[PDB]
Design a protein around this ligand. Structure first.
Ligand SMILES: CCCCCC(=O)SCCNC(=O)CCNC(=O)[C@H](O)C(C)(C)COP(=O)(O)OP(=O)(O)OC[C@H]1O[C@@H](n2cnc3c(N)ncnc32)[C@H](O)[C@@H]1OP(=O)(O)O
Ligand SMILES: CCCCCC(=O)SCCNC(=O)CCNC(=O)[C@H](O)C(C)(C)COP(=O)(O)OP(=O)(O)OC[C@H]1O[C@@H](n2cnc3c(N)ncnc32)[C@H](O)[C@@H]1OP(=O)(O)O
Ligand SMILES: CCCCCC(=O)SCCNC(=O)CCNC(=O)[C@H](O)C(C)(C)COP(=O)(O)OP(=O)(O)OC[C@H]1O[C@@H](n2cnc3c(N)ncnc32)[C@H](O)[C@@H]1OP(=O)(O)O
Ligand SMILES: CCCCCC(=O)SCCNC(=O)CCNC(=O)[C@H](O)C(C)(C)COP(=O)(O)OP(=O)(O)OC[C@H]1O[C@@H](n2cnc3c(N)ncnc32)[C@H](O)[C@@H]1OP(=O)(O)O
Ligand SMILES: CCCCCC(=O)SCCNC(=O)CCNC(=O)[C@H](O)C(C)(C)COP(=O)(O)OP(=O)(O)OC[C@H]1O[C@@H](n2cnc3c(N)ncnc32)[C@H](O)[C@@H]1OP(=O)(O)O
Lengths: 258, 258, 258, 258, 258, 258
């Protein structure tokens, strides 16, 4: 469509990386309903596009996304909430992998949106935080849940109770993010990692992703049994036969996505 | 009351931080029943004090606490356990946040009491450990559970099976504690974090704390749903209206704990 | 027996440590059905030897193990999977502690084998990875489950979806391994950790290992209650009464394994 | 809208109950994609109607519904499944209560659809079953999960593994259904149970329905604590003050749904 | 003490049974704060009385208990709940078994109190219900959790969403209660069950009770393992050795509660 | 082999049902190690037999099994249990369905062995119980877990804490067993049900069985998703195509176990 709040581009080898860029820089990309509706639309389009194997989500160089728009919630009631932040986690239902390339601020709903991605790459000056407590509320889209599971009780409690930000280097050391890149090459490096993934078999990559996600939803006993079943499933695909022949016949693999 | 084994003080801005100091230096604050009874009293008194928004728990410079009291345990039988270990985890039922400021030894029951706190700050010479195995027993107040969830299986196995101590630095790197301070300022630094948590609304802070804790008790799916209900609940308070107004109007929020 | 693929030896003080070494260096220790079978036999023999209190598992300098054997798997089918990698987790059923000493490559099934040990020590040049996705399959023995639980979602997703390796240093920082040592002393350092475990009471150590393992199978509430029960159980042993009388009596405990 | 497969109607005191009637009896209400989409829209419409407080779902007199449409499924593949039957559980996302009035056959997808409702009333000649196994497949929409949790392992295994049907009386005795009525008054009796529900506050009913559904997603300890939060949240509503004043003042309650 | 709203007595063979009778019949046993505090005291006194091995909780003939007390809840606010019905589940922490003998009404808080006992015996005219919804609130002490787990989703949803009562016979058929007896001998029949329990070893009974309770708190795999460790623990008591010796020696066991 | 304690035969149409009869009538089939060992061999042999699709497990007319062997357990110690019950749950790892046909007593370990089967059919004079508590021990092979999940808390507590037996009719009413047959035809009836099961595809039957068992190990969300995956799996098989072709061609299906 004609997007007012984001820009999308297809990037990388063979146009296989979908790039979604939040673009509301005077508001440092605060998450408003308008922008969320567009993000959701773009994610669905990329998800349905057969040439796209992975998505990179990024913002501007000073901010991935600072916050939601407070003015937009300022006047709601308990009843309003309860009976009526609904479309905020559509990103968790995409099957293809999604990499957040975070430069600058990722705060509040912004930190949450990044944690919902499968992988996070941070720029050198990135900063993460959940300042919701400073506004008299608490994180409402996994900020108390995905953060704690990544960084441990002590650091998550400190962040959620004080609102204090942490640096890209603290995030990486704690495992909230897995690489740090220079500011000017962040998105390009995220695009390469996405390309590498997109070169894999899509149906296998989707099973792997589902398998890793399952580790937050099951005991280890049941997570292993699920994994084992996804693993048996891969033997029903041509890609599995091809990847393994390629290694025996010492050649490169040619996946076809089934 | 007139405490035999602890000292309590009110501190920080407006006396908003309750300080509790273990004070049985002759036994390196070994946690005998009597001391635990006084601790639980001091915590309840803080909890009920409307001036108090956070608590700091600390020992002396040489030990936070060197464990449960081995002398009191020596002569117990399997059958004493059964029909008889009891008020050891009252601290987990306090709604207000509790920060452990650990200088020196925190071993066995003492490491466990620190890990039950929301946040741990460590002094430069602090040491953590679970030496229970060296007495022919295992950790009995979360030392195999909270430790493992903070530092990973490999280090928690190594600590629990050998009894080896780790440093403050190793504890920080592993996410068991979140900051390290010089010995002589640790307690002051912990009070400053406490005072920051105490400036926020007491009822919102209690909710946020409940939400974070819930990351250890449910799948990520039901944790996100429970957080969302608590987020909705915030919109039932005056302090949520006041915080959101203050952000929009760009002024200091004046929270009144409801 | 007469082993083709591994070498076993008894080591440490009084020969209390069973060492198992994978020995199929022309395939970089690839884990074929034959070798898994021997490995399982060697594990059962050490578990049954009353002289052995802990096991070290290791490979060569260049590789701990490069994976399941891709040539045996090549012509498997979805129905073969279903109706017939079955003894692949026998190691998780050994009650005595097992430490992986990983030099060089630990990839795919080899990374998984290491992650199933209680403790991992890594050599300076070690590398961990899950390159299954490059063959059109996913990790099938815990590599989406135990990895995620040790290193966090972001790093696990990146490793499983790209197949990229991580260094020993990255692995320690993320808590997948708990110590790093020079290539040449690695095994010796692992035998020392093992010998220390072996000096402790075998019954309490088996309990303490169970308890730590429970942290991935239950909520924190229930894990604490199971631990408490096993902690009560220790009071049924001679070793528990000795270990604590020793401390009180200012003398060396002498453990009898009961 | 112009519905092919279902009929809808408002019923009961003040048009408070929305009635959805599946209406493809030349195929015994076999649930083809077409019918599901229609079903799903009707559910949404009643969900958004501020006059309706409960929905009654029902089929014809001889079949509630005899499964998904075996002819639509005949030629699908394993890769079709993976990459491409999907809106089957929209009903689980409706917040208002939904009662299944089941006359005649409710088999396979049909039995699943009824088990996804909150309440099931059965006509005297109703029959429930999961005959998937007779087609070479297994239940795919909760038939091995919701059935087993309602009837116990022995009866579920017998049903799933043989395909045998059970009677309305066996279903009530086992707790899969909760009342039995004559074939010819079943719908009207469901409607009167729905109107009783619709007389209660709509926000409170939604909270209660969520509490009860959480019994299948959490341990009891966590389900109690979630329940407790929803219970406290009711005190933020006018409806609660109103129901409770009306008891005290011995008068009827007048609820406003907030 | 000198009780205002309850009566206690010791009954059974050798006065081995503590009987607690709720006694506020002019409010049908509405559970005000005051009565809750005396119940809790009486429970604690039987728990510590070494002559008592099991407790029987009953009410009057027309009512066991009609609920929490609506006049004391009437003016509470959301902030009251929050930063404030707290000692309501002390009965769940008593180690000795508690049997509810329910004659007459057990509604709302009163149904919940009975579901918190280990065993419920119902008189012929008893009725069970959760009418909270009719007051614009939801059950707040396990009514949506313990009821659903006993009777299945359909019947719990119907009860919680309509407020309708069910009979003693429906409750027994659904497994909410496990015996029905005549109104006039109900309490003596419950005493008989408690005396039988009290003749058994207290320590093994307590462990059996904990093992049954674990069935609502973990997966079947882990509850089997918890149970196995409790079963090994029994072999530390004299009573277990006595119990089996007596079977093999063809004589009566004499238990000694250890 | 030459079994001392059991008898096996193949039965039903096409000899498709493996019948294992416990045959140690002078001890009422008390389950000593020797008998468990033979039991497990007989089950493995039927598991591996491509003509067998289901197994019927039975005892004699007077006792299915009266428990673990009290004579063998008498002189065990705490410490024996630690290091040394072990192959007691091999039956739970069989993929083919197992039906217990219980005539007469099934008590203690014998009630537990029946509950470990997928389906229980009971003779008219069968009796179920957990009399462990009368020997000073608790159930140790699922008696506090599988029982409670089948019959609800109240009846399970009453059985486990008193040792009282329940009839066949009480068991069927509570959902512990799914059908009652006359004593002299019970085995023939169970074999007929096994024969139906064995008419279906063995690979689809095994997946159906694994799905149903999953209901005890996962929240409903994750149980539904695992089931979905299994459902997709079936589309990789020939039997799924054949069964669904057969309905539509209105002929009888010809399954080939793949
Ligand atoms: C449910 C919870 C269960 C918890 C279970 C547990 O925590 S089991 C407990 C686990 N923790 C312990 O095993 C650590 C035990 N303590 C030590 O190992 C050591 O004290 C230490 C390395 C920390 C410090 O050695 P030092 O030589 O500096 O100090 P020293 O040992 O002389 O201690 C000073 C005095 O405190 C006493 N003391 C120290 N630790 C104690 C303890 N846990 N229980 C009782 N008393 C203790 C001593 O015995 C000595 O008293 P006297 O010389 O005057 O007698
Ligand atoms: C349930 C579990 C499922 C597990 C599934 C898995 O683990 S799937 C497995 C995942 N792991 C594998 O993908 C890693 C494959 N291996 C490699 O990429 C590479 O070998 C390497 C990166 C380790 C290093 O390569 P190098 O070039 O240094 O060494 P090179 O490739 O010459 O390998 C040395 C010899 O070992 C053999 N070999 C190496 N890895 C093997 C493996 N995993 N399975 C079988 N055979 C293997 C190769 O064929 C060459 O054998 P010949 O020259 O005699 O033929
Ligand atoms: C993800 C979710 C997955 C769900 C997957 C599933 O539910 S698998 C589906 C499971 N359910 C099915 O097995 C039930 C199949 N139905 C039956 O076995 C039988 O129809 C019956 C026992 C229900 C009733 O038999 P009767 O003899 O009275 O009626 P009869 O067999 O003639 O059926 C009446 C008409 O309905 C059609 N029909 C009935 N059930 C159907 C189904 N599931 N798919 C499509 N068509 C069906 C038939 O083809 C016939 O139409 P025509 O004569 O015009 O052709
Ligand atoms: C955390 C936990 C939360 C728990 C929350 C709850 O249990 S909420 C509460 C839920 N339970 C209630 O909704 C049930 C309320 N009660 C009723 O519906 C009805 O009393 C009844 C069907 C039980 C019986 O009706 P009867 O007509 O036979 O008796 P009747 O209504 O005249 O009342 C007898 C006297 O008892 C008092 N009474 C009855 N139930 C009460 C209650 N739950 N709390 C306060 N007082 C109660 C009434 O005021 C009247 O006193 P006066 O003569 O002085 O006026
Ligand atoms: C991990 C799993 C742990 C499991 C733990 C358990 O199952 S503990 C086990 C729990 N189950 C038991 O408590 C039930 C024990 N048995 C009884 O209560 C009773 O035998 C009975 C009520 C079923 C039937 O009484 P009757 O008098 O008809 O029959 P009787 O008692 O004479 O049994 C006939 C013969 O078999 C023997 N016998 C019966 N049950 C036995 C058992 N569980 N272990 C060993 N031997 C047993 C008797 O000792 C007797 O042999 P001799 O006369 O030669 O002596």
């Amino acid at each position: 469509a004609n997007f007012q709040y984001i820009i999308t581009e297809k990037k990388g080898k063979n146009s296989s990386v979908g790039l979604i860029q939040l673009n509301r820089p005077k508001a440092l990309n605060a998450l408003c309903n308008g922008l969320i509706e567009e993000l959701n639309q773009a994610l669905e389009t990329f998800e349905e596009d057969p040439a796209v194997g992975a998505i990179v989500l990024t913002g501007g160089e000073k901010a991935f996304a600072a916050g939601a728009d407070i003015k937009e919630m300022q006047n709601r009631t308990f009843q309003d909430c309860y009976s009526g932040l609904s479309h905020w986690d559509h990103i968790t239902r995409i099957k293809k992998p999604v990499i957040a390339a975070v430069n600058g601020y990722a705060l509040g709903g912004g930190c949450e949106l990044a944690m919902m991605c499968d992988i996070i790459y941070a720029g050198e000056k990135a900063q993460f935080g959940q300042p919701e407590i400073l506004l008299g509320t608490i994180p409402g889209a996994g900020g108390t849940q995905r953060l704690t599971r990544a960084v441990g009780k002590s650091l998550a409690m400190e962040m959620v109770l004080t609102g204090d930000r942490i640096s890209a280097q603290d995030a990486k050391q704690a495992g909230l993010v897995s690489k740090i890149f220079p500011v000017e090459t962040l998105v390009e490096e995220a695009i390469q990692c996405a390309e590498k993934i997109a070169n894999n078999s899509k149906i296998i990559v989707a099973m792997a992703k589902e398998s890793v996600n399952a580790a937050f939803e099951m005991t280890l006993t049941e997570g292993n049994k699920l994994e084992k079943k996804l693993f048996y499933s891969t033997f029903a695909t041509d890609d599995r036969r091809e990847g393994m022949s390629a290694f025996v016949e010492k050649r490169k693999a040619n996946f076809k996505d089934h």
